[PDB]
Design a protein around this ligand. Structure first.
Ligand SMILES: C[C@H]([NH3+])C(=O)Nc1cccc(N)n1
Ligand SMILES: [Zn+2]
Length: 106
């Protein structure tokens, strides 16, 4: 499934922060649910799997140190919600950062 790069959300029923929050229920996982919901994510109810309401990009297997906005930018860099909320520049920073990580341990 291709990532949505238009300015229109793939899932408008999940456009509201409050709607996204409800999807998690009791959350046992390593990354905080309010932080996930703030970065556009809602829970699928499949382990720690979340999906962005806008781009539809899915993410599983979250580690405790990992930041929702950073992962959002890393895997779904065409997301227009990400662009609106964080700005190109934050986005490029993240990309430069992860590319330089994926070079200094090699
Ligand atoms: C959040 C985790 N570190 C991660 O990168 N997860 C990921 C990446 C790409 C696809 C899917 N499903 N999950
Ligand atoms: Zn997105």
């Amino acid at each position: 499934n291709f990532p949505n790069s238009t300015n229109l959300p793939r899932n408008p029923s999940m456009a509201d922060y409050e709607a996204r929050i409800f999807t998690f229920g009791t959350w046992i996982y390593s990354v905080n649910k309010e932080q996930l919901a703030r970065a556009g994510f809602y829970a699928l109810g499949e382990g720690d799997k979340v999906k962005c309401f806008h781009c539809g990009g899915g993410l599983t297997d979250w580690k405790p140190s990992e930041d929702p906005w950073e992962q959002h930018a890393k895997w779904y860099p065409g997301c227009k919600y990400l662009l609106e909320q964080k700005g190109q520049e934050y986005i490029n920073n993240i990309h430069l950062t992860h590319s330089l990580e994926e070079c200094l341990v090699r």
